[PDB]
Amino acid sequence: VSPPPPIADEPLTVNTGIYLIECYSLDDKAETFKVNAFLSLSWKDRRLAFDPVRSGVRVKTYAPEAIWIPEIRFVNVENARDADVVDISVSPDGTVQYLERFSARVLSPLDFRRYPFDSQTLHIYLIVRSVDTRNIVLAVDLEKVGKNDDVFLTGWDIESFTAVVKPANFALEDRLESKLDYQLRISRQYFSYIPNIILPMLFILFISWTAFWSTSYEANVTLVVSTLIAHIAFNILVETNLPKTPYMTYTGAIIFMIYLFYFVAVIEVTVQHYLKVESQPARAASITRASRIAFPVVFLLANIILAFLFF
Amino acid sequence: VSPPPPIADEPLTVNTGIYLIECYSLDDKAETFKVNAFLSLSWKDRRLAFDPVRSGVRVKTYAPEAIWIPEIRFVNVENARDADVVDISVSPDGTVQYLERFSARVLSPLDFRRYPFDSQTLHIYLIVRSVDTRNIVLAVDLEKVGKNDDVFLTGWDIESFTAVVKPANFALEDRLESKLDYQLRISRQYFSYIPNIILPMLFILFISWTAFWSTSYEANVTLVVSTLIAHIAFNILVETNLPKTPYMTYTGAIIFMIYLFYFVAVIEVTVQHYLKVESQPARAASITRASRIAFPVVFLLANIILAFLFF
Amino acid sequence: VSPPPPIADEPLTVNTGIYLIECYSLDDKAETFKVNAFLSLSWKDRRLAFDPVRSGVRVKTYAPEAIWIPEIRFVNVENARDADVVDISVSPDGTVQYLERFSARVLSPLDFRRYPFDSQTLHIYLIVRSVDTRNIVLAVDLEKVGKNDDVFLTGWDIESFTAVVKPANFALEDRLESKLDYQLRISRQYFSYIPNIILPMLFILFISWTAFWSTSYEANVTLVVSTLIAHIAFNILVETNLPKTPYMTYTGAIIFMIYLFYFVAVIEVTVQHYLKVESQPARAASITRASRIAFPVVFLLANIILAFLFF
Amino acid sequence: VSPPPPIADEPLTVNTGIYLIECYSLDDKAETFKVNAFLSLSWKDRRLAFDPVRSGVRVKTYAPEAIWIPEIRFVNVENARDADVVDISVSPDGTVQYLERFSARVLSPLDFRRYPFDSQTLHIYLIVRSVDTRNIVLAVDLEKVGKNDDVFLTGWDIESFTAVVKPANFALEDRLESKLDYQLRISRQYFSYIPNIILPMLFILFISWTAFWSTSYEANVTLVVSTLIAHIAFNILVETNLPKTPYMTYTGAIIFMIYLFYFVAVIEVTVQHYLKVESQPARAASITRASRIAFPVVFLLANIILAFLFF
Amino acid sequence: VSPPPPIADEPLTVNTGIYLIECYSLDDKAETFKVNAFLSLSWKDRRLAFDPVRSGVRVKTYAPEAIWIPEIRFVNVENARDADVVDISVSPDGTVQYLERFSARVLSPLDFRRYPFDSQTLHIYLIVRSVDTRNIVLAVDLEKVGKNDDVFLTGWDIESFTAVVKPANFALEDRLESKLDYQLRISRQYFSYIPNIILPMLFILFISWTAFWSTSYEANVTLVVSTLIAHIAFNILVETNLPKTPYMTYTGAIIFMIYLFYFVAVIEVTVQHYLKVESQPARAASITRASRIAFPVVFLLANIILAFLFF
Ligand SMILES: [Cl-]
Ligand SMILES: [Cl-]
Ligand SMILES: [Cl-]
Ligand SMILES: [Cl-]
Ligand SMILES: [Cl-]
Ligand SMILES: [Cl-]
Ligand SMILES: [Cl-]
Ligand code: NA
Ligand code: NA
Ligand code: NA
Ligand code: NA
Ligand code: NA
Ligand code: NA
């Protein structure tokens, strides 16, 4: 089969629409998500036109094999989409109405800078390669772009599913390609991070600061070192749920900065002891008393500065 | 092939039934379960009707290709179901009896609020898209709905497998859709959680409270900090078996609240020592004596309040 | 094609046989195992009978397509078996001899009560659905049931591979189903558990009891708390290799009971210190001296009681 | 199609050859390895004979479907090999030269007794089932057996890839089976084990022995218990990279024996303290002084004995 | 179908080109990466030639089945590539322009010597086996070799994608083979390693050195042993993200060497205590004072030596 012939030299417009059914498995480490939706395509093929009076019927159904169907592919998919044809319907003028149900693992990158208080724009790129007979251009039928109300992405809030109506028309391997951008705007449900990582991490830090109300070196060493290891466990736990970024993430920055607080606490604890042993507990008392105010104040200000830089 | 013709303007009723053979792999993190079942379909096609005297036979068997079969899909499945046709049998009046054995990974969300003392309703949604010739409506043939006696879902108790007999008939992409709700009611086997997580977690908490019968700061610091680290390991272990929820789970709440008890124990231990050093062991004795009653009482009441809010 | 016709009203007997070539991947958590075997089927179809004198051949080979083959399925399989036909041979009387090679992930439940000193009976269920023309019944040709000598299941000892010769006939969706039970009897190789989990776990417990020969509270607290944490690690390591059971496993019971020994050791250590501080070291000495005998004796008797209840 | 006809009662010889391209994914836990190779087959089928003077073409090419091809299977594979036909060349006498390139997950058992200083022989078993027309026997055309130079198996050294030229001809389910043995000899690259597990494990053990130059019970308890916990982590780490064996592995034995050294160190530390408290530091001094020589000497001799038994 | 006939004895040149659409999943442990590209093939088949005047058309499209297509395979792929034909276009002279979109898991080895400051050259090898009619040789059509701007390999910087224009022409199983080398040059984004592994690891080491400003053996033992355990946790975390190499990696060397610093710190701490107890605190003071300079200086020089050997 060959593509439909042009009336004049116009390109063939394939109207598209994606309707999300099931949306799942957003892998932060892999920067992938799995989709399960409807793909609706529509184009005019005059060769398929018929008289509704003479034929009796208002629409004609065809098998994919019977007629010409545009080879529509997804750009950022991992493997080729799994698709199953729901319907192919021709109206008297030759307007073909294709519908298929598909599933694909889509590879759209993520910006972890404000993690876990981040929002993402997932992309689904539809593309079409022009044949030698004629150039094929994509379009968005906005009435055929939507999503189910049940559509739920675990640990995420789905904000919008829209399409950038003007396609990107460009050359690739000496043939004209028409790309379309479907954007799924989502925002992370940060709630669980608070009682599971953030608050536990702050509690262990404040426990390390009880060393500023203790003269026992052996007890302080235990307090600051033990809590530093729990902080190491939280750093490891966090960096497992995330990929290696060439930039600093919000949680990454807080986690990193807290190491400096542990390091300075070890110095204070060491200084206090050296001074006490050197028979200068008065000077050690001044340093310990100051640290009680300095550590919370510097922690609170440093956090104001970080939240400011990141948001 | 085309769909059966209407005697009048009535829609075509496809009677359905799901009989679960094997139910398995309930992933709490993914909110998926795998199923292995029979899917039975029954509809009347007058074109297939025959005389049982003239033809000799009582029923006629057909290959799927020979006749029209309604396109039945599952809504909340992950990928398209794996199905294999068991039988197609036509009765003299034209009543078709389709049977297929399928497997699918079903995506039904879970409510972890009362975890691990939760009960779930897993859903299997059957759907059908109306063709242009005529509208297709689903029905439940209750005699062809069930579960095998052997059906076991590891770590769960299977309560019931029923179907909401009235379909959800609605419009989608300008065509009628008939959705059916098959509900699998299950309840978690919480027993293992008690000797593996709950009791070990309570033992480590009570061990931290032996610091209220000790004047040794060095020993108390070790007792409360060491047991706090074991509590962190239990928090990590628990949050691995579960997905990130935008709400508080029952175990999540208890685990979180227990951090506050560790934090207040560190404060008491610190106050006792400061007072002893400040040569006020009488006042430190009053606080330590009070804590011995306060901590268990507040723990017991806080737990009564939590169990009340959650159940 | 249609099934063979009955000489009288008798059902059609399909003689079966499974011969294991490779047996592997027993997942304790999933209660699955992978199998790679031959499935052999034999039934009489009089329509296929021929005179060996007139025809020239002793046996005739047919492609699956050509003749009627009974639809045999596995009940407890996860997904449909992967099968490849080795041979189809018809003798002069019409006796068909089918052979295929297959692989399947079989879902047979396990009894972890005596873990890791448990024995299991894995099941492979063959089933057949009767058609409208005639009822189909399964049989066991014992000369065609066996296993290769090389057959090895990693971490397990293969005891026997037999079949329950009388099928389990029952009605399902108003049609006769003939089920067959192939049983693979295996027993766990517990050897590794001894130097990796059991002996390390006992060593850490005995180390906690060296606190009964020490008056140093700070040292005892460290001994009992540190070893309790290593016991938590062993509990976590063990519960990862196993699924969540609604019953107590043997290792689960020992692991649980050992927590009580750690809890009572913390109490003794606390009592000894309180008494020493209260200037009653004579009474604390009596308790410590008693504990030295009590703890090993109660541990040894409690273990005799457990081994008795479980074996 | 039928198998080629004989000249006499001679069996049909299918000449074989395996040429490894890619060798990878050696799973120690699963005792599997993945292989991407060429499987070459050759047999004579006089029925395919042609005159090139008349046919124009020295050799004739065919699609697998067009002619009879022996059903050659692998014994020890997990699932059926993924194969793609490269070439089928038929010369005028009727000699078929079959080429395919496949990938398979071969299941060949491993001997971990000398781990990580072990050498393995991985097996790839080719098999063929005789048909009723005539018996089929396998052969090795040594000119078509080899491996690529680039063939690298991560963490292993590939020594040789050879075939046992004489097939194993045996009876199975009353039909001749001709099995061939292809052997891939490999030896583990033990180097990473030395700086990652062996030396770290020895360092922590020697650190525990610094307790023989310390009179501080509190410090000794910390030294021996802390280092014992690091040894538990190394035991856990090692047993994760390995399956549960019914025998003792070399690393398993060293790891196990080291527990006894920790247990005896705890006894010495306890004895020293009891004696010091009992006002017998002279006797405690004798035991501590002896331990300084005993522990390294017994460790060194025990290791000589183990290396001797294992190698 | 047969291959195109030669004008003379020249081989058939198949011009190739790979253009990467998406590049993903670089597994350091497995030494694999997944690719999704275009594969373009061009060769002349005079049998397909046509006059543009007489035929009207400028180019003729064909289905893969209609015409002869060279069997191009990838050497270092894991399983056979997933490919889907985009276009086949024949010019009047008989020049075929084939295009297919494919996905494959490519197995190219990695050099972890400078990890995580390493650069890699990933390879994609295209190969072709000569048929008996004529020899087939590969070529690089540089205008049809490239990558998309969006191409992102998580945690890596993509430097270049080029092809070694001269193929490797060699004999294999008595037929010629034409191999082509496509090289993807990438360099690791080491930035995340600094705040997550390197700086945390240095902080814990410096904390261990605060023992040189403390006379408390009990506190020093805790400082050096606790920080040694956190270093073990970093060694384990690092060796999980990497495969077992027969050479020393840069991070591996630093991690290893740091163990020696912990071991010498334990010795110093032990010597200081022995001397203090032996009533020689003056000599212990000299050693402790020296260690304060020795440890940082030796650490800094040893690191200069390592960076020199590795870079
Ligand atoms: Cl696609
Ligand atoms: Cl479906
Ligand atoms: Cl099956
Ligand atoms: Cl019954
Ligand atoms: Cl029946
Ligand atoms: Cl095979
Ligand atoms: Cl390939
Ligand atoms: Na078409
Ligand atoms: Na149909
Ligand atoms: Na059949
Ligand atoms: Na064939
Ligand atoms: Na072709
Ligand atoms: Na301590």
Residue numbers in the entry:
A (entry chain D), B (entry chain E), C (entry chain A), D (entry chain B), E (entry chain C): 5 to 315
What does the paper say about this structure?
In the lower part of the ECD, the principal (+) face also carries two acidic residues, E82 and D115. E82Q and D115N display significantly higher proton sensitivity than E82A and D115A, respectively. Assuming that Gln and Asn faithfully mimic protonated side chains of Glu and Asp, this would suggest that residues E82 and D115 are also proton sensors. Assuming E82 to be in a protonated state at pH 4, Gln is not a good mimic of a protonated Glu residue because Q82 is engaged in a completely different set of interactions with neighboring residues. Therefore, the E82Q mutant phenotype is likely due to local side chain reorganizations of Y28 and F156 rather than being a proton sensor itself. There are no significant differences, measured as 5-fold over Wt, seen in the backbone Cα residues of any of the resolved structures, with the exception of E35A and E82Q. The E82Q side chain takes on a different rotamer, causing a local change in the backbone, as well as a cascading rotamer/conformational change in Y28 and F156, the latter of which flips out towards the aqueous environment. All structures were in the apparently open conformation.
At present, the best structurally characterized pLGIC is the G. violaceus ligand-gated ion channel (GLIC), of prokaryotic origin. Each subunit consists of an extracellular domain (ECD), predominantly in a β-sandwich fold, and a transmembrane domain (TMD) composed of four helices, labeled M1–M4. However, the GLIC is a pH-gated channel, activated by lowering the pH, with a maximal activation at pH 4 and a pH50 around 5. We instead found that proton activation is a complex multiple loci mechanism, with the key contribution stemming from the coupling interface between the extracellular and transmembrane domain, with E35 acting as a key proton-sensing residue.
